[PDB]
Amino acid sequence: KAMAGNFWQSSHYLQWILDKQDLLKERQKDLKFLSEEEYWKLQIFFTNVIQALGEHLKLRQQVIATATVYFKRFYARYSLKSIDPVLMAPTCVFLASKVEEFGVVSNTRLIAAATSVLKTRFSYAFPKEFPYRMNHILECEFYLLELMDCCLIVYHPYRPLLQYVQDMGQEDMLLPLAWRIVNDTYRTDLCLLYPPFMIALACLHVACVVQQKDARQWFAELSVDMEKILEIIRVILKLYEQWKNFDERKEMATILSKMPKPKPPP
Template sequence: MYRVSVRMPTSQRIKDEENEAAAREWVISQTVTKANGTILAPKNVQNNLIPTYSTPSYLSPGFSKANLPSQQWLLDRQDLIRERQQDLQILTEEEYQKIFIFFSNLIQILGEQLKLRQQVIATATVFFKRFYARNSLKCIDPLLLAPTCVFLASKVEEFGVISNSRLITTCQTVVKNKFNYAYTQEFPYRTNHILECEFYLLENLDCCLIVYQPYRPLMQLIHDIGGQEDQLLALTWRVINDSLRTDVSLLYPPYQIAIGTVVPLASVTLRSMREI
């Protein structure tokens, strides 16, 4: 981190009750944010005392807020349709969506069998959808990519690395017992396939691995609403889990998904409570 010297405002210019807050703010302001080359200046420091910084040379000329990971994977519906044209020449839109519902269910069951948290399962599902938002289904077998997404998500969400043998064994069991109507043969992939596929997944995700989920804003919204929080949380939680099978995670930010889930269900729940 780079550090610069900023002249501390004199105590005469700071009200007594703001001394402590101003001092903390001044200390924070010493650190230059390397991401965009700017400095956080305290409110009581005049602007002409703060040096300005241009965009660092190691950032590309096209760097902007739109390039941040949180914005990079918010896609337009037309972009999705354009990227899917190769698959939609063979499949109908309904068939295409059914395939993603199928593999989202596979990821969900696989995560449950591995005793993963829902946050990990949701991140794995988002990884899966982001990969195929830019690639055809013919690029990598979804049956291989699904456990690879689970494997990567468990590390990203700091759940702990799943042992390779346990992952393969669980995949074999799930495919044999839960999806034998679709796969007549056993799970064909081994550890080396998962590890190799992980590199392709990382490359296509541009190493943007932090996924913001709607669960945290959902819980905050429900807490603010009050009332029957447990009942409303259970309903909205299930709806958000189901939304992972659709394209909303690619089209809208997490807080909008949370609001879109809470508002109608809260109205129905509160109306039911009044009727009771």
């Protein structure tokens, strides 16, 4: 696949691996409206919306992942009020599908998919029907491209994970669990802060601990900073406790009402 093996001179690496302190500083704008807890709940929520959109459209996981990174990059820089995330979510899916060479989702199929998914899976949060049309998608797409500075190729932890488990010789035992943990990392900021291979290693380690597989020796003979891996592991462990404590369907209507909304023309 295109640009595989080029991560270290990629736009992903060189422009879109952000500093945590920069990220949180830009987030302070929105944290005047939402608590930190509410902010990480909102992130979980839109991760899930994008995954649902992707599944409905039958997109491969990598396209969904790319769409999710586009969404995160945009709100890493700008406030939730700049563009309605309900509009940005399907716009990200649409652009990612084109970039990943899967196809241009038709106008009516994109709008029908967003309308259906919000109505079927998310009616607890959205009592009104998806109000946006394709002209809004196309306008949003331009703002998205501009913000990302046309940095469209995104690397993910799935490929390195695949290589790691094959090396262990534990494809059948550990791959399904570790892959699923990788999906779950998209509920957090991790993909903005660390190279994908590190996230892959953290997910695989957690999978090993969960399945009681001894892989100490294997991890020991890697030439990577295990301090960074351990930071990533702690975020993963935390996301499951957050998952446990969060009732999305009960909380999201209230949290969405707290989001700052777009100012109208004066």
